[PDB]
Amino acid sequence: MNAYYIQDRLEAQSWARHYQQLAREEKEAELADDMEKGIPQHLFESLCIDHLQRHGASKKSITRAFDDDVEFQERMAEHIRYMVETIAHHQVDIDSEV
Amino acid sequence: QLAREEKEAELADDMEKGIPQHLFESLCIDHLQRHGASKKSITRAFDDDVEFQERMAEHIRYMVETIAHHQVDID
Amino acid sequence: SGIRWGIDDDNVRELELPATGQHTWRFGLTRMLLGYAMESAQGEWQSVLPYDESSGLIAELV
Amino acid sequence: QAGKAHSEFVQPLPFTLPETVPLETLQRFWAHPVRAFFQMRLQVNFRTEDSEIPDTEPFILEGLSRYQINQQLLNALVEQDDAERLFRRFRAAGDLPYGAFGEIFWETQCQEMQQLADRVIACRQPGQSMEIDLACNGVQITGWLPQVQPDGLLRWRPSLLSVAQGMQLWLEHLVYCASGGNGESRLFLRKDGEWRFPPLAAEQALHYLSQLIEGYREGMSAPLLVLPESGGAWLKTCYDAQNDAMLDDDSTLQKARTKFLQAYEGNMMVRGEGDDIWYQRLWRQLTPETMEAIVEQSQRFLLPLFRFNQ
Amino acid sequence: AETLDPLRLPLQGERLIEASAGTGKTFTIAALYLRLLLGLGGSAAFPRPLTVEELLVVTFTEAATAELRGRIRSNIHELRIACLRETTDNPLYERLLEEIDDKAQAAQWLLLAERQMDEAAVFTIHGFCQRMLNLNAFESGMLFEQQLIEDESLLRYQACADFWRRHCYPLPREIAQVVFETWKGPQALLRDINRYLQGEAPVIKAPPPDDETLASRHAQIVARIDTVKQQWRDAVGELDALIESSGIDRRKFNRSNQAKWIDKISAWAEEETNSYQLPESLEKFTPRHPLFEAIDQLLAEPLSIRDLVITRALAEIRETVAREKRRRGELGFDDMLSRLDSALRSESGEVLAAAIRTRFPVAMIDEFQDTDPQQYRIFRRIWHHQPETALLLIGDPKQAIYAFRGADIFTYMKARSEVHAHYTLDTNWRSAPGMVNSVNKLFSQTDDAFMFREIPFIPVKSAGKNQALRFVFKGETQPAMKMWLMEGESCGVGDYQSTMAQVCAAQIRDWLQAGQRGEALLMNGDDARPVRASDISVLVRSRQEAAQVRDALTLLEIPSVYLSNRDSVFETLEAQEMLWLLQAVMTPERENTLRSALATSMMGLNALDIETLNNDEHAWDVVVEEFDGYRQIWRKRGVMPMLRALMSARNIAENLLATAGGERRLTDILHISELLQEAGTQLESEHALVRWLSQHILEPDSNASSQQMRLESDKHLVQIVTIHKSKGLEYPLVWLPFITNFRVQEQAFYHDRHSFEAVLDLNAAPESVDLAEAERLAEDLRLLYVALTRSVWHCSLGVAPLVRRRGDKKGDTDVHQSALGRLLQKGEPQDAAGLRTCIEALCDDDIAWQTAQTGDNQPWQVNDVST
Numbered sequence A: 001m002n003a004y005y006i007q008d009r010l011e012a013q014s015w016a017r018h019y020q021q022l023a024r025e026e027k028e029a030e031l032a033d034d035m036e037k038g039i040p041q042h043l044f045e046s047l048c049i050d051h052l053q054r055h056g057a058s059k060k061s062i063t064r065a066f067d068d069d070v071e072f073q074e075r076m077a078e079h080i081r082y083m084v085e086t087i088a089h090h091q092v093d094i095d096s097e098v
Numbered sequence B: 001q002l003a004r005e006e007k008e009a010e011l012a013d014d015m016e017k018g019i020p021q022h023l024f025e026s027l028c029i030d031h032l033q034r035h036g037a038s039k040k041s042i043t044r045a046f047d048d049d050v051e052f053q054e055r056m057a058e059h060i061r062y063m064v065e066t067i068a069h070h071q072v073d074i075d
Numbered sequence C: 001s002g003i004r005w006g007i008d009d010d011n012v013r014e015l016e017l018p019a020t021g022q023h024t025w026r027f028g029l030t031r032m033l034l035g036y037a038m039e040s041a042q043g044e045w046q047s048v049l050p051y052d053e054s055s056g057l058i059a060e061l062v
Numbered sequence D: 001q002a003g004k005a006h007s008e009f010v011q012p013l014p015f016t017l018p019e020t021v022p023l024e025t026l027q028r029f030w031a032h033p034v035r036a037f038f039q040m041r042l043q044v045n046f047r048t049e050d051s052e053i054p055d056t057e058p059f060i061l062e063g064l065s066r067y068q069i070n071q072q073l074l075n076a077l078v079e080q081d082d083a084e085r086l087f088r089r090f091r092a093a094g095d096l097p098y099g100a101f102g103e104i105f106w107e108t109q110c111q112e113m114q115q116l117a118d119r120v121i122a123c124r125q126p127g128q129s130m131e132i133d134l135a136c137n138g139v140q141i142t143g144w145l146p147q148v149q150p151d152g153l154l155r156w157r158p159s160l161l162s163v164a165q166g167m168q169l170w171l172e173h174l175v176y177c178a179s180g181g182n183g184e185s186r187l188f189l190r191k192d193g194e195w196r197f198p199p200l201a202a203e204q205a206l207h208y209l210s211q212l213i214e215g216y217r218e219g220m221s222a223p224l225l226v227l228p229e230s231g232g233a234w235l236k237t238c239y240d241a242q243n244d245a246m247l248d249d250d251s252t253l254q255k256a257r258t259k260f261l262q263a264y265e266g267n268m269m270v271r272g273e274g275d276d277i278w279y280q281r282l283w284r285q286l287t288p289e290t291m292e293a294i295v296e297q298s299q300r301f302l303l304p305l306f307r308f309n310q
Numbered sequence E: 001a002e003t004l005d006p007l008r009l010p011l012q013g014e015r016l017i018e019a020s021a022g023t024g025k026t027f028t029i030a031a032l033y034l035r036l037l038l039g040l041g042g043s044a045a046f047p048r049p050l051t052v053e054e055l056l057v058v059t060f061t062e063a064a065t066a067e068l069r070g071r072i073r074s075n076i077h078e079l080r081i082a083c084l085r086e087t088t089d090n091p092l093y094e095r096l097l098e099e100i101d102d103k104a105q106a107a108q109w110l111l112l113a114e115r116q117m118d119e120a121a122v123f124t125i126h127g128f129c130q131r132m133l134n135l136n137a138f139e140s141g142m143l144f145e146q147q148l149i150e151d152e153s154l155l156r157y158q159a160c161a162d163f164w165r166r167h168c169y170p171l172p173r174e175i176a177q178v179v180f181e182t183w184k185g186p187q188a189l190l191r192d193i194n195r196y197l198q199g200e201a202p203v204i205k206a207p208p209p210d211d212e213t214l215a216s217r218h219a220q221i222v223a224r225i226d227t228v229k230q231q232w233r234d235a236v237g238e239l240d241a242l243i244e245s246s247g248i249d250r251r252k253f254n255r256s257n258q259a260k261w262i263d264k265i266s267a268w269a270e271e272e273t274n275s276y277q278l279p280e281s282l283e284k285f286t287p288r289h290p291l292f293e294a295i296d297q298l299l300a301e302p303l304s305i306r307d308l309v310i311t312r313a314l315a316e317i318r319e320t321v322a323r324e325k326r327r328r329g330e331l332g333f334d335d336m337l338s339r340l341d342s343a344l345r346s347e348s349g350e351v352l353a354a355a356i357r358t359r360f361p362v363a364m365i366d367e368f369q370d371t372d373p374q375q376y377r378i379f380r381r382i383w384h385h386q387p388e389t390a391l392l393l394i395g396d397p398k399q400a401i402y403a404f405r406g407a408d409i410f411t412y413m414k415a416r417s418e419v420h421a422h423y424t425l426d427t428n429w430r431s432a433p434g435m436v437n438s439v440n441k442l443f444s445q446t447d448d449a450f451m452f453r454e455i456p457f458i459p460v461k462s463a464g465k466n467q468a469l470r471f472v473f474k475g476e477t478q479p480a481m482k483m484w485l486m487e488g489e490s491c492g493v494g495d496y497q498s499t500m501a502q503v504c505a506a507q508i509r510d511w512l513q514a515g516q517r518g519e520a521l522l523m524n525g526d527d528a529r530p531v532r533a534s535d536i537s538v539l540v541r542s543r544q545e546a547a548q549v550r551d552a553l554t555l556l557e558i559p560s561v562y563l564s565n566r567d568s569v570f571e572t573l574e575a576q577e578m579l580w581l582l583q584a585v586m587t588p589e590r591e592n593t594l595r596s597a598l599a600t601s602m603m604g605l606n607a608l609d610i611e612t613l614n615n616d617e618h619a620w621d622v623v624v625e626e627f628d629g630y631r632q633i634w635r636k637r638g639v640m641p642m643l644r645a646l647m648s649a650r651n652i653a654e655n656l657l658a659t660a661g662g663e664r665r666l667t668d669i670l671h672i673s674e675l676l677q678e679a680g681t682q683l684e685s686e687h688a689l690v691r692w693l694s695q696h697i698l699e700p701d702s703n704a705s706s707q708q709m710r711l712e713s714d715k716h717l718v719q720i721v722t723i724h725k726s727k728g729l730e731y732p733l734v735w736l737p738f739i740t741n742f743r744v745q746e747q748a749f750y751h752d753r754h755s756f757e758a759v760l761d762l763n764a765a766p767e768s769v770d771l772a773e774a775e776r777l778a779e780d781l782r783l784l785y786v787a788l789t790r791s792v793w794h795c796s797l798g799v800a801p802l803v804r805r806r807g808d809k810k811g812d813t814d815v816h817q818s819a820l821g822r823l824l825q826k827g828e829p830q831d832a833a834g835l836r837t838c839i840e841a842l843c844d845d846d847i848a849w850q851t852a853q854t855g856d857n858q859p860w861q862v863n864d865v866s867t
Helices: A005-036 A041-051 A059-068 A070-096 B002-018 B021-032 B039-048 B050-074 C009-014 C025-037 C057-061 D023-031 D033-041 D064-078 D083-093 D100-123 D163-178 D202-221 D230-238 D250-264 D277-282 D288-301 D303-308 E025-038 E062-085 E091-099 E103-115 E125-133 E153-166 E173-182 E186-197 E214-235 E251-262 E278-284 E290-300 E306-328 E333-345 E349-359 E373-383 E409-418 E433-443 E493-515 E543-555 E573-586 E591-598 E607-615 E617-636 E639-650 E652-658 E662-682 E686-698 E766-789 E819-824 E832-841
Strands: D020-022 D128-136 D139-149 D152-156 D184-188 D194-197 E013-019 E056-058 E121-123 E390-394 E423-425 E469-472 E481-486 E521-524 E536-540 E560-562 E718-722 E733-736 E749-751 E758-760 E794-799 E847-852
Touching: A005 A070, A005 E493, A005 E543, A041 A059, A041 A070, A041 B021, A059 A070, A059 B050, A070 B021, A070 B039, A070 B050, B002 B050, B021 B039, B021 B050, B039 B050, B050 E251, D020 D023, D023 D033, D023 D139, D023 D163, D023 D202, D033 D202, D033 D277, D064 D083, D064 D100, D083 D100, D100 D152, D100 D184, D100 E173, D128 D163, D128 D202, D139 D163, D152 D163, D163 D184, D163 D194, D163 D202, D163 D303, D202 D288, D230 D250, D230 D288, D230 D303, D288 D303, E013 E025, E013 E409, E025 E062, E025 E091, E025 E103, E025 E390, E062 E091, E062 E103, E062 E121, E121 E125, E125 E333, E153 E186, E153 E306, E173 E214, E173 E306, E186 E306, E214 E251, E214 E290, E214 E306, E278 E290, E333 E349, E333 E373, E349 E373, E373 E390, E373 E409, E409 E766, E433 E481, E433 E766, E433 E847, E481 E493, E481 E832, E493 E536, E493 E543, E493 E733, E493 E794, E493 E847, E536 E543, E543 E560, E543 E718, E573 E591, E573 E617, E573 E639, E573 E662, E573 E686, E591 E607, E591 E617, E607 E617, E617 E639, E639 E652, E639 E662, E652 E662, E662 E686, E733 E766, E749 E766, E766 E819, E794 E819, E819 E832
Parallel strands: D020 D139, D152 D184, E013 E390, E013 E423, E056 E121, E481 E794, E481 E847, E536 E718, E536 E733, E560 E718, E733 E794
Antiparallel strands: D128 D139, D139 D152, D184 D194, E469 E521, E749 E758
């Protein structure tokens, strides 16, 4: 004989919807730390060693960017994390699509 | 001074054509397929999503500008 | 056999709901009676697919 | 409070494997090995009461209703038969939505199933069904394998990629490689999922088949615990295809434990493998000791799955 | 605001009383009830003495109305005896006897007031209108007899499917293509408007015209998109622009996506032109093309059929449900409150309000912070300005967490501004003085911390009886409030729930390990007592948090129970096994149905016993014989006697109590046997009884009588309870591990700061989203105030710099979005170092902070047993 029974059932489903969205974001970050370890910066350094030398970029310039310069390695780790998190975003979305 | 920055920017614009977004996709398709990233998911990021391409070409612009800066430092 | 909504098509319009022609006791019965005469593998007839489950003496309950 | 507590439900039972095992029996056994031992062995099957008839005409199709249409449509697309005939057939039965929503749902289904069909049509060749008679551990296996092309086994189902579908193709590929049948075996599923097993010699084919038949008589004796999904999820994280060896690292073991509980415990979107009538009767709550026993037994049978998969 | 003396309060017109948590506001109503009965207080007294049946008390909870009825019944009996004895041992009754002129006549009035307490009126809001509208029928225009409907969800989905049949099916395929994108069907359309259907219909910002149909809005936006489609076709093939380093030559891919999207019509989704539009191009940096700005015209206003379909559905479905209930004759709880509001708002409602003033020439409303726009307008239309009738409104604006139920704090804010009288009670009797100063200091950091000027925070003071309350753990006394701060910079919610539930469960077993040896004691003066698992309470916000603390605490071997669990009995495994029993007893001859029942966990037969049963057909025939005898008792008696004989013969009742955790299993079996006996008397058909059980197993009924009962001995087990169900109780030791967590409501719903009217916006414009998030944040602040005041001696709460921000940026933390984070940081976003410094600043002698460190030693000790 509860008057608010209908409002109490809608509020109980609202929390289960919030933790289903939170569990989908945590699964996205779990695959984010894995794929980050799959593409270390030396893979992109090797990709630069190939195509950049024909345009006039010396091998020491690419070595000084990746190995020497710290800010480039910092921005690359943030870019790799953003690329992975976006790919993991679409991967989780495709997996979530029925 | 002003010319050195112009030669660095011109050199970075020439390297931007050398590294297309599909070049990073080829490396991301080979290595990341082992970790569970499907071909459709990698294709969606490098193509479908616009915000991804905007930040992608922005960092590529940042990469070719920083490498060219170290190249002029070697010169 | 897809028997859910009201019994007839006239009953659907009596409730001011748009007339469909399916998911009714008349649609289900005709779907079940058509399956008794004709196998479901033949095809549609009135745009009602025959219901193959009872072709036999058990169809007398229909 | 002087009564005795309930003893553990699992008990060893004697069993003698006959000399003739139909292939349909092994296929139904390895689908749900825990459920098998209840029905196959002990003749115990819990009947789920028929679900309440929906009180309204379906607005959207879900569950087994859309799975049958996806299976009827996929078979018609690979044969290149007119899909509008099947559309008018389903709409005549009223199983689809009414009016335009029946057209919108049908075209977005025909758009997804056509992508899966174009991959099946490319490698498909006309073939005939063959009959199999084999001797493994002195046991005769009889059955039929439908649509065997000279290239190998070709199967297509409209569902998500699962280890239960890979195990189903695995037993079907081993029985194919044991009698002649030089060639591969392929299975196609929704969302690009694929199971492809390279050809093997009759030596190795009868060896892994002997391990599967030995698990059958083991399942008939005791309720062998193998979870195809959860046990496969723990095995996928630990096993590495490059080095062909499972990782003993503890950090990857804790991740595999989280992935194992993720496959066991289901969410609102997708129901989990852990909750079910057959698994609830054995244990009301899952203990770490039995979780290890499931891991060890799944590490045994389900290992050649990920080993030869490509 | 002024302090309140219960005997010095004049009762005339409208009076407002605010009572802080723990002030015993229920004790104040009894004092004013005895004051209204005897007509005491002189110039502040009611003009005439009144009868118990003429006093109206409104309390929203039914359980509180029965407790207040017995509380007043006992206070009338104590004062009556005190009048005959002329002396009393209590201060309140002593001050009452001082104001009493003639004690003999007053004792006769209390005697007549004691005999009438059976018809004494204490009602809920929904129990009031039901009795009032049935009192005078003609003014309300309602049938004399009406049956209450418990669940309106069935008629809501029925009417929602009726709207989706008439307003969708006839639509053409091109229009139906757009409706399919917003939602799949009426099931998803209902979930959107379901919060809007309950309660009073709010006001929609910028409502569509009444004559606009679906095809009108469809053809309008299609023409709006078709113009941009034509213009981009003709002007494609020209690149002239100012080139910036932000942009690059890869825009050609985005340009080609515009050409592919234009060629196809009927697609309501839009490709991304944002970079190509003029304002965003101005943000990146000018071509100044006419159709370049025409895209801005398209992107400025949102293109959807959502707002139109929802508006038509909200009005029509409410009419269909009300018409269907009027056909059946059933009335809902919300419909009765709308009936009295529609009756008083009618022109003939003026005579209706005159009979209420004569029936009850006074009113006292408990829990006034909980209320609806329908409720207040009813109390206002009656008692606002009347010469002889007063009004008493009691409630704490900081105590209203019920906005999910439809409670509006702005309704109280509108009510508070209209009443000139204000009275507050300054004596907190519930907790220790250390907790009073800790709560006052925490809310005194900022000014208007509750974010609403109309709700002030005022300091309270501990009484003289509680000044000796102390809590000792391992020698020297422990401070009243202890905040547990996690270590590290960024912390995820999953990592926050995990670690804190392990630290909280670790500190609970440490209180239990020191409680069994007598080291940890709850001390009042020189008296003390060990710390039982009873007084330890864990307060979580949701059910998913209760199970996460339950698994972490049970892993340490501390038995605990969820008091607020709403899970139905039919969801448990035994309820499904109860179906396989009654179904097998129905057909004992069937071999598959009988073997399925004996293989259930309730019968307790081992797999070896089932194997030996299949090997011997004679033993199977004997089981068929006993199951036939069970079917005979089933037919001659019922469900309950047969299950009693089955449990007695199989001895499963004793075997379940021997199995660990089996007594919880047995409590569900007996409770189902009670419900099956309830539904067994109504339906004589035995197969219809099995169909009734199977029907309730598929879909849980959720009814309160169908809710799982509490297990026995749980009084000695750690109590986990929700913040909402814990309001008004006493918890000596409280834990708030997850209090730092928060959720953001994405929908836009709010109340205007001026008109104080509920306003929903079907448009996503961020304005209404910001005003909606501010109301959620203020509600979370009130959720924290109640949870902090539940404690008596000590309370502990977890704090971590959790970050829900995308990418885990290191600039700032989102703790300011949380309720407790806003009060420590003064509403200012900071870093993890700033959060730690603000924690170390305010802690003196009461608040004390310790780092959160995970550790494990031993789960617990048995305490053995007695037999």
